[PDB]
Amino acid sequence: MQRVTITLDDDLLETLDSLSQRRGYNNRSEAIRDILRSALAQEATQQHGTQGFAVLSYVYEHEKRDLASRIVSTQHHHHDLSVATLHVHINHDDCLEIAVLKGDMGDVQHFADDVIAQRGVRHGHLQCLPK
Amino acid sequence: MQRVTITLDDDLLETLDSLSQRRGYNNRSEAIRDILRSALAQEATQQHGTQGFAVLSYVYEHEKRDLASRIVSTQHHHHDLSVATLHVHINHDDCLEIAVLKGDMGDVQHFADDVIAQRGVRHGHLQCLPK
Amino acid sequence: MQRVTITLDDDLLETLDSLSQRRGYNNRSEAIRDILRSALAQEATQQHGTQGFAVLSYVYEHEKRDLASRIVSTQHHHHDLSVATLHVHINHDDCLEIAVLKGDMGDVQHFADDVIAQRGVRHGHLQCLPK
Amino acid sequence: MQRVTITLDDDLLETLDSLSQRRGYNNRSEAIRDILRSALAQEATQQHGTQGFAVLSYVYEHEKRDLASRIVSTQHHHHDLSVATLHVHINHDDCLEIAVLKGDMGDVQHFADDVIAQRGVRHGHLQCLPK
DNA sequence: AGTATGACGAATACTTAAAATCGTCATACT
DNA sequence: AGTATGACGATTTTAAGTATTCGTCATACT
Ligand SMILES: [K+]
Ligand SMILES: [K+]
Ligand SMILES: [K+]
Ligand SMILES: [K+]
Ligand SMILES: [K+]
Ligand code: NI
Ligand code: NI
Ligand code: NI
Ligand code: NI
């Protein structure tokens, strides 16, 4: 098999290990392998063509890599694809934005990842509602 | 923080890396992490004790007398969970409502149900975001 | 850009400078500007062909079965002037709605009126932001 | 009397002068004096006591003065007076934000100023709805 | 009185350089 | 297989410094 080195926040790591231990896992590699495999398999994306509405929601640290200042530009670039976005400051560092999108379910998907992917933007998620 | 090495079958890794490039993160580490945090969260939102946030999105028509009226009511019902609610008038008689909620994941789920029910609520979807 | 000097009575200036420090701007120039744009943009809305954005806010009781799903219907009549509408649930029966509107300042003021009307809408206010 | 030099955008200055001319004003200093005096005198501050809800709404170039990330930062500083904020991208450069505030009408008022005073935040406006 | 401008400390925008983190591999001990 | 690290380029943070653009007061013209 292949080796791979990932880098995790201390908290993430603990949260992960313990939870892997309470499940009967004696080795991380298995543990993680099962999750990747699982969540990876149960996947699906948006067919390019249909139009409609989408609801992109996600959390992120506004401090990390001028994410706040950046996320906006990211959107203003396709400002003809954003209806509005609702923000909710959940604490000094973290933020929970919810963006309503409208247009080519394709462009949407893009713009979505143009966000979600960013390092320091956890729990990304795009929900679609095509005409 | 922390850095770890795991081992996964040549097969899986390929599947993972496809995702890395295919959908955004040209970073294997993040890809994993985001999939790791998905995991922890699921098996945290469906765990006794957890509190947090949540994004309940749904559609419905403003043409039914016993549809648009109830929603708001049954929502004020537990107005201690509703942070706010963005609403869009997609077309002439259809509404796209997104409601951000906050509290014990339990009640929250409950609260979501008592909303997706009210006949006329289509595509109802809950997205939990623990602490 | 442009820089100008004006002359005002010792009296007035003192009143202005109190405002500068008292309420934010520790900058005389801005203080003035903001007050100047209030003036202009005011006698800019009450005019012809004037188009732009507007923020219609108001409160009401959802308890009244003819007030809850009553506002949404009116808004759906001008679903072409509505962008989105944020809504909060102050308490068991109080609603705080904010409707962001775009279009011609006429139809808007119109629209607003209709919504300010529907008996039971208190504190109703509309702010215009011409282009 | 006292001399004072303010700095204005070219457009602002023209918009202002012409409008001052169409009103029978032969000198700017009078024109401006009258507006300052008026709107200034016609104020309405908030006392540190009454709690309630507020509706702060403004526009601002997100690239100017790092506003996008600063605004956020400041709000996260008073992240307890903030319920939720609705953003709307009107164009590549400008943004229309609507923050719904809650708490001691006095702090709100303060906070609101910590947003409106900013060079780069035009048409700022606070609307109060106490208890 | 009402308008323009010079002059210059203060605030903000651009560049540029060094320091601290992250993302992957590869080697090495369990 | 699993897990832990050194090594090292790519990505971000900080710090630093210079060119601009502001905000006001002072001086001078209209
Ligand atoms: K991410
Ligand atoms: K609430
Ligand atoms: K609409
Ligand atoms: K908050
Ligand atoms: K301002
Ligand atoms: Ni925030
Ligand atoms: Ni609607
Ligand atoms: Ni309500
Ligand atoms: Ni914007």
Between CA C1 and C1' E14 the distance (Å) reads 21
CA distance D127 to D98: 11
Q: What residues in C contact A86, CB-CB < 8 Å? A: 86
Are A59 and A113 found together in one domain? yes
For D103, list phi and psi in degrees, rounded to 5: 140, -160
Residue C43: enclosing H or E segment and its boundaries?
A: none
Distance in Å, residue D69 CA to nucleotide E10 C1': 22
Minimum distance, in Å, between the CA of residue B8 and any CA atom of chain C: 47
Same domain, yes or no: D54 and D94 = yes
| φ/ψ (deg, to 5) at D46 | -115, 135
Which tokens sit at D16? 């202002």
Distance CA B79, CA D83 (A): 13
- In this structure, the answer to whether residues C106 and C73 fall within a common structural domain is yes
Is residue C75 located within the same domain as residue C116?
Answer: yes
Q: What's the total number of domains in chain B?
A: 2
Neighbours of B105 (CB within 10 A): 25
Amino acid at D52: G
Q: How distant is C1' of E21 from CA of A58, in Å? A: 24
Nucleotide with minimal C1' distance from the CA of A27 is F2
* Sole residue written with tokens 């229309």: D96
List the D5 CA – F24 C1' distance (angstroms): 7
| Optimal mutation site among D88, D89, D92, D96, interface A, most CBs of chain A within 10 A | D89
Q: How far does CA B104 lie from the centroid of its chain?
A: 14
Q: What method was applied to determine this entry? A: X-ray
Neighbour tally for B3: CB within 10 Å: 10
**Are C59 and C106 found together in one domain?**
yes
Query: How many whole angstroms separate alpha carbon B22 and alpha carbon B32?
Result: 14
- Judged by CB atoms closer than 8 Å, whether chains meet at D72 and A84 is answered as no
Give the span between the Cα atoms of D116 and C25, in whole angstroms. 8
A65-CA/F12-C1' distance, Å: 7
The angle, 0 to 180 degrees and rounded to 10, between the axes of the packed helices A105-116 and A67-77 is: 170
* C-beta of residue C74 within 8 angstroms of C-beta of residue C110: no
Chain D residue with minimum CA distance to C9: D1
- A64 CB neighbours in chain D (<8 A) are none
Residues A37 and A87 in one domain: no
Query: Cα–Cα distance between A97 and D68 in angstroms, integer?
Result: 14
Q: Range of D12's domain?
A: 2-47
Measured between beta carbons, which residues in chain A are less than 8 angstroms from residue C83? 83-84
Note whether A24 and A57 are same-domain residues.
no
How many other C-beta atoms are found inside a 10 Å radius of the C-beta of residue D19?
16
**Residues whose CB falls within 7 A of nucleic chain F?**
A 1, 3, 5, 27-30, 33, 64-66, 119-120; B 3-7; C 1, 3, 5, 20, 27-30; D 3-7, 119
- Looking up residue B89, the CATH number of its domain turns out to be 3.30.70.1150
Amino acid at D91: N
Nearest CA in chain A to D84: A88
Type of residue numbered B81? L
Please report how the helices C68-77 and C105-117 are oriented relative to each other, as an axis angle in degrees rounded to 10: 160
D67 and D104 share a domain? Answer: yes
Distance of CA D36 to the CA centre of its chain: 15
List the shell of residues around ion ligand 1, using CB closer than 5 Å. Answer: A 121; B 34
Domain identity same for B18 and B73: no
Last residue of a domain, one of C47, C69, C84: C47
Residue D113's SS3 state is helix
Question: Are B86 and D86 an interchain contact pair (Cβ–Cβ within 8 Å)?
Answer: yes
Looking at the structure, do residues A35 and A60 belong to the same domain, yes or no?
no
User: Do both B23 and B84 map to the same domain?
Assistant: no
Q: Which amino acid is at C66?
A: D
Please tell me if residue D122 touches chain C, with a CB cutoff of 8 Å.
Answer: yes
> What does DSSP assign to residue A62?
S
Q: What are the start-end ranges of the H helices in chain C?
A: 10-22, 28-42, 68-77, 105-117
**List of residues 6+ apart from B68 with CB closer than 8 A:** B60, B61, B62, B95, C68, C69, C72, C73
For residue A87, say whether it is annotated as part of any ligand binding site. yes
DSSP per residue, D28-83: HHHHHHHHHHHHHHS-----SS-EEEEEEEEEEESSGGGHHHHHHHHHHHSTTTEE
Tell me which residues of chain C, numbers 68 to 107, contact chain D at a CB-CB cutoff of 8 Å: 83-84, 86, 88, 90, 96, 98, 100
For residue A49, the one-letter residue type is G
User: Where residue C34 sits, what CATH number does that domain have?
Assistant: 1.10.1220.10
Same domain, residue pair A27 and A60: no
Partners of residue C53 on adjacent β-strands:
C102, C129
Phi first, then psi, for residue A62 (nearest 5°) are: -70, -20
- Residues lining strand E, beta carbon within 7 angstroms: A 3-7, 119; B 1, 3, 5, 20, 26-30; C 3-7; D 1, 3, 5, 26-30, 64-66, 119
- Chain A residue numbers with beta carbons less than 8 Å from the beta carbon of D66 are 69
- Bridge partners of D118, per DSSP, are none
